[model samples]
Target: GFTVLSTKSLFLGQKLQVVQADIASIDSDAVVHPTNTDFYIGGEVGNTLEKKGGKEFVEAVLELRKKNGPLEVAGAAVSAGHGLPAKFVIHCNSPVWGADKCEELLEKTVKNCLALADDKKLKSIAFPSIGSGRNGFPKQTAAQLILKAISSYFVSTMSSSIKTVYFVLFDSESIGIYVQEMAKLDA
Candidate 1:
């Protein structure tokens, strides 16, 4: 079962929840993938989605990637969900470097994902901490940037049907950091 440690309401009736659960099991209109710039669907969170999506998901994305070539950091691409719970999968590329990276890249990638979903008129979306696994994103910082980006997107856009975004962390520590950050916005 998904255990929600914290949740907070944001701008334009948007809501943020930090929970430890299988990302696929979380309810949403779409799932956001912290993917390689090339749009290859192979990684921690990516693997689960591929398995659930089966051949349909694989073929759809592979065909799209074949045509898409390389996606850029802070850029996003979309794919049909097929067998998955959501209607679409949004792939966002995040910068992998340290201080050399843009301070706003994570937030930008997040906003890009939300924009893709909103553009499609999705009512909700799920997100992972981009760059946190073998991708080498520092989890703590990833949590902060992700939350800020979601809050910013809702406050800035003030449009579309995306009213809930789940920060589905893989563990307690990551979930804790997100809980703390979103809690501050409520204070």
Candidate 2:
């Protein structure tokens, strides 16, 4: 079960929200799946995506990596959602904390994910608490950066195909951090 924690409207009537839920199950037009440069879907949310997206989804990811080589930090790509509720999965390679300029890279990744959704003309997209898990980013800081990036994108872009954006978090710790940070947007 999921709960909507906070919601805010951006320019162009775009809606952004914080929700406590499994991102893979969120019924959005598309969902962002945090992946690695090696294109490995290894974390809890990522593994869930792979399992639910099934064999075809796995194959598509392999094919993409084979054709494109390793995805650079903050880079993103698209692939079929297979059996998930979302229509498409935008795979974004987030940077590890030890990496130089990790915070900027993390923000760039969130922005890139939004760009991919717009490129596909998707009306809505959901994102997990990206970069806060195996990537070693502190949850509180990651939450703020993620929200900042999303806010900046909407403020700077003249137009976008996306109307709804969800920061779908899975755990109470992440949910608290994201919701608190998101509320600052309206303060």
TM-score list, all predictions: 0.92, 0.92
lDDT for each residue of candidate 1 in 1-187, tens digit (9 for 90 to 100): 7777677986467777877877866667888877777776777778888877889888878877988778888889888887887788888888774736554887788888989998999988888778677657777777777777777777778676787778888777877777888887741
Name the 10 consecutive residues with the lowest summed lDDT in model 1. 95-104
Clashing pairs in 2: none
RMSD of 1: 1.8
Candidate 2: residue 9 Cα off by (Å): 2.4
Question: Compared with the true structure, what per-residue lDDT tens digits does model 2 show for residues 1-187?
Answer: 6677878776457888888777777889998888888888778777888767788778877887888788998999988777788899898999998899899999899999999899889999998888888898999889888988988888777677889899887677877777678767842
The candidate scoring highest on lDDT is 2
Model 1 off-target regions past 4 Å? none
Cα distance off (Å), candidate 1, residue 123: 1.0
Question: Local distance difference test, per candidate?
Answer: 0.79, 0.84
